[PDB]
Amino acid sequence: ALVKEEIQAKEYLENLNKELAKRTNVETEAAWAYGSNITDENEKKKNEISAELAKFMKEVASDTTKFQWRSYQSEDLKRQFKALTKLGYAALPEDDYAELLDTLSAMESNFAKVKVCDYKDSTKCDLALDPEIEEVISKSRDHEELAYYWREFYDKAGTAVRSQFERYVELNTKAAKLNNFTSGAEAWLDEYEDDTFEQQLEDIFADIRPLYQQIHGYVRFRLRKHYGDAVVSETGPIPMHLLGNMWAQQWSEIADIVSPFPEKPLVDVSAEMEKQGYTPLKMFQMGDDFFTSMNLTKLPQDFWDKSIIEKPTDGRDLVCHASAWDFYLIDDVRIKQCTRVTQDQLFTVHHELGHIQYFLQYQHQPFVYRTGANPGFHEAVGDVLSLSVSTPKHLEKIGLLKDYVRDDEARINQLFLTALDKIVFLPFAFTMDKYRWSLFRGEVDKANWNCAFWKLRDEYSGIEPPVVRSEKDFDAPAKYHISADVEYLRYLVSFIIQFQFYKSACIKAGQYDPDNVELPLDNCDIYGSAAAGAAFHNMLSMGASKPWPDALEAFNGERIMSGKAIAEYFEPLRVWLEAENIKNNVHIGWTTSNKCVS
Ligand SMILES: *[C@@H]1O[C@H](CO)[C@@H](O[C@@H]2O[C@H](CO)[C@@H](O[C@@H]3O[C@H](CO[C@H]4O[C@H](CO)[C@@H](O)[C@H](O)[C@@H]4O)[C@@H](O)[C@H](O[C@H]4O[C@H](CO[C@@H]5O[C@H](CO)[C@@H](O)[C@H](O)[C@@H]5O)[C@@H](O)[C@H](O)[C@@H]4O)[C@@H]3O)[C@H](O)[C@H]2NC(C)=O)[C@H](O)[C@H]1NC(C)=O
Ligand SMILES: *[C@@H]1O[C@H](CO)[C@@H](O)[C@H](O)[C@H]1NC(C)=O
Ligand SMILES: *[C@@H]1O[C@H](CO)[C@@H](O)[C@H](O)[C@H]1NC(C)=O
Ligand SMILES: [Zn+2]
C-alpha cells in the first residue's frame, strides 16, 4: 500500500498547493481592498471570504488523515502534510470563527480610525496618528504637549477596545487548544520549530541587556539636562513621552538632544531629501536599485501598477501601518505605505521591499513553502539593506550626506544613533509578546491586565507612562500589532539575526574585516555586491521548504541564532559608553514605576 500511496500523495499535494494559492489569492484581494479602504461593506466581504477559505481548510485538514503521511519516506512530503494539518484559527467552529473575524475587524478599524483634537485648538479634531500625532511626538520638546497627545491616543486606541480584546484572547485560546497547543503562545512559537526557542532568546537578551542599561542611563542623564529634574528623575523610569516615539520602541528621533558629541556630525538626511525633491516614487525606485545592484530580482510591473505608496487624499479611512503583500500568483506583489520623505521612511521602504524580494524569491515553491524560513527571517531581509543605507559611506555616495568627516567622535555619534534604534528595541519587542503570551497562557487575572503591561515595560525597558494609569485604562492595543493580532517576536528575532546576515554579507562583499581599521562593520555598504546577493538568493529561494537552521546555513554556513554579531557591531560603542557613564557618574538602573495603580 505505502509506496503506491506515497506516489498518489505527491500528486494530491501538487494539486492542493495550487488550489490553496488560488483560493488565498482571492482572500488576499478582499483583505487588500479593506485595508486600503475601510468601509462596512469591505469588512463584510473580507470576513465572508475568509470564512469560506476556513471551511475549505477544515476539509483539507480532515483529508490529510486519509494519508499515512507520517509513514512516508520523503521528508519533503511529510513536511508539506504537516503544514496542511495546521489549521490555526480555521479550527474554530464556523460561528466562533466568524465572531473572531468580527472582533479582529473591530480592533483593527478602531485603531485605523483614531483621530484626536489639536492641543492648541479643540475644534480641529481630525489629527490621525499617521501623520499628525506622530509628527508631534517625534518633533515637539514641549513635555506637556507630548503628554497630551500620549493620553489622547492611548485612551482612544487602547482603552476603547478592552472588551473586544478580551473576547479575542478567549477565541485565540480556544483556537490554539483545538490545534492541541496549550495556548496561542505555543501556537505562535511553533513557527520557530525549536522547543528551546524561548530559552535561547532569554539567553541572548541577558547578554545584551547590560549594554541596554548603559544606553538607558546615558539617555536619562541627557534628558535631565534638557528638561530638568522636575520632568526626569535620576533614579526612576524614563517618562516615555520624551523618547520621540508613541511606544518608546526606538529613540532615534531625540538623537539631537542626547548625541555623545553634539558639536560633531549627526546623520539626519531628511532635510536634504526634501531639498533634492525626493518623492515616495523615487524612494521606492532607489530601493529597487539597491536590490538589483546586488543581482537580486527587480520589482515587477504589477508592483508599480497596484501598490499604494502615498496616503490617499480623498478622506477615506485606511490602515496606514506600512505592509507588504503577496498575492500568491506570479509577480503580483504590492506595498501599502503612507510614505513620507524622511530618513526613517527611506529605511522603512527598504524594510518593506525586503519582504517583496522574499516573495519573489520563493514564488516558484509549493504554496505551503511560500513563506519565510521563520517569521524573523522575513522581517530581517530589508533591515540588512537598511543597515547599509544608514551608513555615512552609502549616504555620501547617493548625495544625501555632505561635508561629513568620519573621525572617532562622528563614529560614536553614528553608533549611538544606530543603537537608539537597534538595541533600545530589543526589550520593547520582547515585552510585546511576553505580555500577550502571559494573557494567552492564563497567567494574569483580568483584573490585573493593564498593570501587567506597564509592569513588563518597566522591568524590561525602564520606561513608564507620562500620567498615572490604572485598570480603568487598557493600553496594550494602542500598539498597532496588538490591535491587529500580529505576532511581535518576529521583530526581536529579526533584530538579532539581521546582524548575523549583515556581518556575513559585509564579509562576502569585501566590506568588513575585523583586522582592518578601514573596513569597520558599522561603515559597510553592500550596495552593488553580487556576492552578498548570491547569499540572499541561496537562502530566500528556499522559502519554508526546510527548517530555518538550513536556511541560515545556505546563507553563511551557520545553523545557530546568535547574539555575537550584534555585540560585535556595537563593541566600540560599549567600550566608549561604559567609560563615559563612569566619567559622568551616571546612575544606572531604575526604581519600580508608580505610574500604574493596581
Ligand atoms: C487533539 O487531541 C485529541 C485527543 O486529545 C485528538 O482527538 C482524538 O483524535 C483521534 C484520532 O482521530 C480520535 O480517534 C478515533 O477514535 C474513535 C473512537 O472515539 C470515540 O470514543 C472516544 C473515547 O473513548 C470519544 O472521546 C470520542 O469522542 C469518540 O466518540 C475510533 O473509532 C477511531 O478509529 C478509527 O481510526 C483508527 C485510527 O486509524 C489510523 O489511520 C489508519 C487508517 O488506515 C490506521 O490503520 C492506523 O493504524 C491508525 O490507527 C483505526 O485504527 C480504526 O480501525 C478506525 O477506523 C479513532 O481511534 C479520538 O476519538 C479523538 N479523541 C478525543 C478525546 O477527542 C485530536 O484529533 C487532536 N487534534 C489535532 C488537531 O491533532
Ligand atoms: C471604497 O469602498 C467603497 C465600498 O464600501 C466603494 O464604494 C468606494 O468606491 C471605495 N473607494 C475607493 C477610494 O476605492
Ligand atoms: C547573477 O545572478 C544569476 C542568477 O541567479 C547568476 O547566474 C549570475 O552568475 C549572477 N551574476 C553576477 C553579477 O554575479
Ligand atoms: Zn516587516
Residue numbers in the entry: 17 to 614
Paper text:
Angiotensin-I-converting enzyme (ACE, EC 3.4.15.1) is a promiscuous zinc metallopeptidase with a number of substrates, including the vasoregulatory peptides angiotensin I and bradykinin, the anti-fibrotic agent N-acetyl-SDKP, the neurotransmitter substance P, and amyloid-β peptide. Here, we present the use of the Drosophila melanogaster ACE homologue, AnCE (which, in particular, shares enzymatic properties with cACE), as a model to study the structural basis of ACE inhibition. The high-resolution crystal structures of AnCE in complex with the dipeptides VW, IW, YW, RW, and WR presented here reveal dual binding in both the non-prime (dipeptide-1) and prime (dipeptide-2) subsites of AnCE.
Due to ambiguity in the electron density maps, WR-1 was modelled in dual conformation in the non-prime subsites. The observed Fo-Fc density makes a strong case for both conformations of WR-1. The arginine of the WR-2 sits within the S2′ pocket and forms H-bonds with Gln266, a hydrophobic contact with Phe441 and Phe511, and a salt bridge with Asp437. The change in binding conformation of WR compared to the other dipeptides appears to be highly driven by the backbone interactions, in particular the carboxyl group, which occupies the polar pocket within the S2′ subsite. Out of all the dipeptides tested in this study, WR shows the highest Ki value for AnCE 840 µM (0.84 mM); this partially matches the findings of the study by Lunow et al., which showed that WR has a significantly higher specificity for nACE than cACE.
